[PDB]
Amino acid sequence: EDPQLLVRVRGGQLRGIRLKAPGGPVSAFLGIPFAEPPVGSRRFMPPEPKRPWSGVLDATTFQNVCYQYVDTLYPGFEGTEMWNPNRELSEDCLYLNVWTPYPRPASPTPVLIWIYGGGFYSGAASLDVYDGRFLAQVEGAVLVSMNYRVGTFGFLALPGSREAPGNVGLLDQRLALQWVQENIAAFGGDPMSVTLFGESAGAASVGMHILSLPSRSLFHRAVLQSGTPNGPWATVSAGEARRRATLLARLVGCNDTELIACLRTRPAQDLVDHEWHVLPQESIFRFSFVPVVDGDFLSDTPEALINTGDFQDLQVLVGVVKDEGSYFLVYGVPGFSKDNESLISRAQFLAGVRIGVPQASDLAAEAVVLHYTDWLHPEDPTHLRDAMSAVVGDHNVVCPVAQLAGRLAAQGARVYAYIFEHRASTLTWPLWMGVPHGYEIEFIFGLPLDPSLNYTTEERIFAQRLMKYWTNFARTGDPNDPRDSKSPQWPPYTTAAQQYVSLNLKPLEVRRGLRAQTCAFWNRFLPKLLSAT
Amino acid sequence: EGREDPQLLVRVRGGQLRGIRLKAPGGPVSAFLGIPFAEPPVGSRRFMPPEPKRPWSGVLDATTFQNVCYQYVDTLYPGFEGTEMWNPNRELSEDCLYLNVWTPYPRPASPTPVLIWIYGGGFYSGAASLDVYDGRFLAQVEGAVLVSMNYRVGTFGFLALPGSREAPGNVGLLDQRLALQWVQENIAAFGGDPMSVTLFGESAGAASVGMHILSLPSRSLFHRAVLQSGTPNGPWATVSAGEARRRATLLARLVGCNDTELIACLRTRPAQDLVDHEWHVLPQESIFRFSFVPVVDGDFLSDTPEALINTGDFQDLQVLVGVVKDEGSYFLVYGVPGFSKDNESLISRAQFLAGVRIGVPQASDLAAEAVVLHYTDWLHPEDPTHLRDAMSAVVGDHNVVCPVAQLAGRLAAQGARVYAYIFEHRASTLTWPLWMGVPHGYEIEFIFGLPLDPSLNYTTEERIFAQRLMKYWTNFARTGDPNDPRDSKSPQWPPYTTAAQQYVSLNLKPLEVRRGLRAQTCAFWNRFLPKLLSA
Numbered sequence A: 001e002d003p004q005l006l007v008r009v010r011g012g013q014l015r016g017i018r019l020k021a022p023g024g025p026v027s028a029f030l031g032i033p034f035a036e037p038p039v040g041s042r043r044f045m046p047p048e049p050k051r052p053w054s055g056v057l058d059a060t061t062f063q064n065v066c067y068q069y070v071d072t073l074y075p076g077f078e079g080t081e082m083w084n085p086n087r088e089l090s091e092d093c094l095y096l097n098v099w100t101p102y103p104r105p106a107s108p109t110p111v112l113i114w115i116y117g118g119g120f121y122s123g124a125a126s127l128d129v130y131d132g133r134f135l136a137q138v139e140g141a142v143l144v145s146m147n148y149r150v151g152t153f154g155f156l157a158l159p160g161s162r163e164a165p166g167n168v169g170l171l172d173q174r175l176a177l178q179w180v181q182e183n184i185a186a187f188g189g190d191p192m193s194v195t196l197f198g199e200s201a202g203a204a205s206v207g208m209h210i211l212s213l214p215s216r217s218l219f220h221r222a223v224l225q226s227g228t229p230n231g232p233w234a235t236v237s238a239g240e241a242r243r244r245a246t247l248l249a250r251l252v253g254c255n256d257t258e259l260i261a262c263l264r265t266r267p268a269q270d271l272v273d274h275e276w277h278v279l280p281q282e283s284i285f286r287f288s289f290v291p292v293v294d295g296d297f298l299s300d301t302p303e304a305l306i307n308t309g310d311f312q313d314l315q316v317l318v319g320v321v322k323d324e325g326s327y328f329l330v331y332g333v334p335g336f337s338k339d340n341e342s343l344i345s346r347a348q349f350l351a352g353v354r355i356g357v358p359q360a361s362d363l364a365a366e367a368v369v370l371h372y373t374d375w376l377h378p379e380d381p382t383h384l385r386d387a388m389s390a391v392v393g394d395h396n397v398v399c400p401v402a403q404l405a406g407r408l409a410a411q412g413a414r415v416y417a418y419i420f421e422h423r424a425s426t427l428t429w430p431l432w433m434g435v436p437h438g439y440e441i442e443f444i445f446g447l448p449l450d451p452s453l454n455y456t457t458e459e460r461i462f463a464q465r466l467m468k469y470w471t472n473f474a475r476t477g478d479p480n481d482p483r484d485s486k487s488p489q490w491p492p493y494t495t496a497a498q499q500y501v502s503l504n505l506k507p508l509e510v511r512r513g514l515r516a517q518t519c520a521f522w523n524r525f526l527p528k529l530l531s532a533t
Numbered sequence B: 001e002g003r004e005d006p007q008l009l010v011r012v013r014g015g016q017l018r019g020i021r022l023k024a025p026g027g028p029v030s031a032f033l034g035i036p037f038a039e040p041p042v043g044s045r046r047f048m049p050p051e052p053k054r055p056w057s058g059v060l061d062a063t064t065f066q067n068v069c070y071q072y073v074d075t076l077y078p079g080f081e082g083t084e085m086w087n088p089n090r091e092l093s094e095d096c097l098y099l100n101v102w103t104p105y106p107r108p109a110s111p112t113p114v115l116i117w118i119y120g121g122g123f124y125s126g127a128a129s130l131d132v133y134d135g136r137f138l139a140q141v142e143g144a145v146l147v148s149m150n151y152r153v154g155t156f157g158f159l160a161l162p163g164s165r166e167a168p169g170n171v172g173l174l175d176q177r178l179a180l181q182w183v184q185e186n187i188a189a190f191g192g193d194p195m196s197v198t199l200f201g202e203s204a205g206a207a208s209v210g211m212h213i214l215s216l217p218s219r220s221l222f223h224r225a226v227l228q229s230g231t232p233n234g235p236w237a238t239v240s241a242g243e244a245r246r247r248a249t250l251l252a253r254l255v256g257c258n259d260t261e262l263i264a265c266l267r268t269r270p271a272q273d274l275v276d277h278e279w280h281v282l283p284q285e286s287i288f289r290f291s292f293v294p295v296v297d298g299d300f301l302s303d304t305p306e307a308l309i310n311t312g313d314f315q316d317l318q319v320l321v322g323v324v325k326d327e328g329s330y331f332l333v334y335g336v337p338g339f340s341k342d343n344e345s346l347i348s349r350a351q352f353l354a355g356v357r358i359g360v361p362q363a364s365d366l367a368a369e370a371v372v373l374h375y376t377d378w379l380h381p382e383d384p385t386h387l388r389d390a391m392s393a394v395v396g397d398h399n400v401v402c403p404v405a406q407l408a409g410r411l412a413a414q415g416a417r418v419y420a421y422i423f424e425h426r427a428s429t430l431t432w433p434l435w436m437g438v439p440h441g442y443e444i445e446f447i448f449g450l451p452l453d454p455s456l457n458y459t460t461e462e463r464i465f466a467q468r469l470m471k472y473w474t475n476f477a478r479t480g481d482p483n484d485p486r487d488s489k490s491p492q493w494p495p496y497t498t499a500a501q502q503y504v505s506l507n508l509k510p511l512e513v514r515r516g517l518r519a520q521t522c523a524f525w526n527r528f529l530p531k532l533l534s535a
């Protein structure tokens, strides 16, 4: 009985496990429950705090993954399987994981809290790419990650109802943050220095905690990687959530109370079977059950909230990867596949645009096509393919990120921005996808420090750099090494100068304007084109 | 006769002519100035098509320029060469249908290719007698036969009540065609070759050239065309029949006036009265818009220029087309607040959004906003220098550069041999401020070879550059190809194609080939904007 691995939290005693990290040992406490299991009549409901337990609870293994769709499109392929559940599915999934250094920190240590992506329909805090042992070992970070309910179970809402009020998956996240406040000191974490970070839907969740007042007293800094609370995919309105839930119920054969009660009688897989049948158009980068503008968790649209919010005592790191859109095209755009070069025709490109911008009218879609066509080479298959990627990435990620960066800076927040430009050498996906959505994560979490993974020696050095920016940012609100002259420095992003840095194998380079002309099209013009039509 | 220079006496269909021996730098040239080619379009002939000049008796003295067609005179900057050079330099009169011929001296031995110049000035001004149009240098240095004609401008040339008999519209274009017919019949008396006639012109002159390409009765009158900073298509070169009726009716009311009665009343009005009100008829506050221009009558122009270029057969056609570096800058001082020739015209963002409404007068609110969003530099959105240069580019691109691109592309796709240039050298002698860069109209003096006149103060480099441009123009007139057959040392000017979109830079440096004539921006004006305005 290693007394390093024995902790008393408010609910009772936990036994962690000592894990091996390349530079030494770390204490991991995995599968710690923070809520009553949301099963039975607790489906679709806000999470209740976990009841106190007796004796010593075993926290040496990851718990179950929240019930979700499992990707099947490319069976056995590591590029997709890395994002698949790596534990048993269950609605009993409300557990978090803590990594600390070994021995546990002598003094209060900044806490990083990770919130996975997966489009609000998948994900799990147990995937290898979220392994927190490296950050814990190399940087002395206390790292926390939680499971939260996804798909219908987290986000199915009949707005205004008692038994499906929406956003419960975010409330799951809020409870896990509350748990960190009440318990993290026992692990040597500092509850007065909590940084949230997350990628894709994980980032938009971070953003919603920024935009929801009850969350604001649970953290101090935020990192948003390749996702935002604003934009076309992260929220739906009350009316459109109501519609999708009602439609899903009809599809599984089911007064709000009565509708939800019948939904509760249904096996988990039955709800998942019809998850994808509720979207109003054929689309990519669009997800069925996502946070809803409820007037409660979200008092208004993210758009309204970021426009009018006051962000004075807030520090934020935001960024994108070089190729945010490539990945998505293979999931419904005719002419795209990982198994060839996906060189498309012009006609395929116009059709791809109606799918990438499913909300777009004929004219708006025309505007998109005309803007992304290279008129020097209008029919060049390579350009058309790269443009299709760009349309999707810009519309869903880069331009929403630029908008967020701008509003926050203008409203007093301290903002740092990046673009991630290094393609992992170990990448399973073909070269034309470049640096795809999600492939910065393994570098930030420090996987290349694991020799058995076959990352190049330069990639290991790169990983070390990124863990430093992230943890420096967690420590101080500033990603710059405070005891290191020469970098050159990573400057704050501001609306005037619009400075941001490239992260790649070469040293930091400062650029200005994050797709400034193109984001002006998405952020300023396009809204006017639809709002008149 | 008996005592005159025997080489200056020529006979044409209308009678005998006496011309003048003129000094050019390399030697003498023959000029025949102010040859009548129509009956004076005066009195009951105002607004009417031209009738050919009736034969005269005796020897017509053809030694001086004749009247300039009645027109508005620019007074914005009195005394300033920049504006004065474009102003009438002979008496204003409705009796103005005269033409000019320069030939080598003595007149050439074998039939020589003919260049016909059609001046610009928005269809409200111009004259073939202006110094920048002096054909003496092309005649002496290149051996060219050069012809230029006066044609009616303003109300006298374009006021139309479409369908009527007393004001059919496009009569200024008919003046031009008559002078083309005069060249067919008479040019051989001067040693000119009626089987090698090339039209060239700038601005409205270029629009005019393009309209002769699109109007079949003019087609048999010439073989090749150069269009300099202007096209028959685009937003200013033509009006609909409806809009011309509207403007002609309004102008009638303003001077206090059934189509026959209206026109008969307008005929009793003095010429100056009409000029005094010609600017009061435009539908909006604008720049680069002119009141009385060619009308789509379904006769001279059987359909819109845009329709005619999209469906025409241009297999047999050779065209040279191009633009200057700063097409729009000139236009900004005549109506956009914030701009002047006397300061850097550094403007604010507000002055930019207002300038866009005036420069794109036909744009709705959405389109205006589209224009503004496209031309804004979102890194420095409030920067005055950028806003100044963007305002210029908006006006240049909308009116000249993008219409030219549309033209080159549509003509090429459909058989024509098209050569394309951008002219980028600013005259050392220019009197407009530096911010205006290379303004509209300022390549003309180089094409015509004025820098060859020692007394004009051009650099030696400019004199050489001018000779190069004279070479290209006359090669293209001669053969349909601007390149020198011998000279394989000098880089080649490739044709413009839809596939490759090639064009050359014209400056002091050897020809450099560039690709894509403002390709991205022109997709906005030519593909996007029309759709936006259909909603």
Ligand SMILES: *[C@@H]1O[C@H](CO)[C@@H](O)[C@H](O)[C@H]1NC(C)=O
Pocket (backbone or CB within 6 Å): B337, B338, B339, B340, B343, B344, B345, B346
């Ligand atoms: C330059 O001159 C114009 C016209 O006189 C004036 O309106 C403008 O304000 C001046 N520009 C500046 C800011 O110096």
Ligand SMILES: *[C@@H]1O[C@H](CO)[C@@H](O)[C@H](O)[C@H]1NC(C)=O
Pocket (backbone or CB within 6 Å): B455, B456, B457
């Ligand atoms: C050209 O330069 C000379 C010498 O300065 C001057 O006397 C003459 O008037 C100039 N001619 C112009 C301004 O065209």
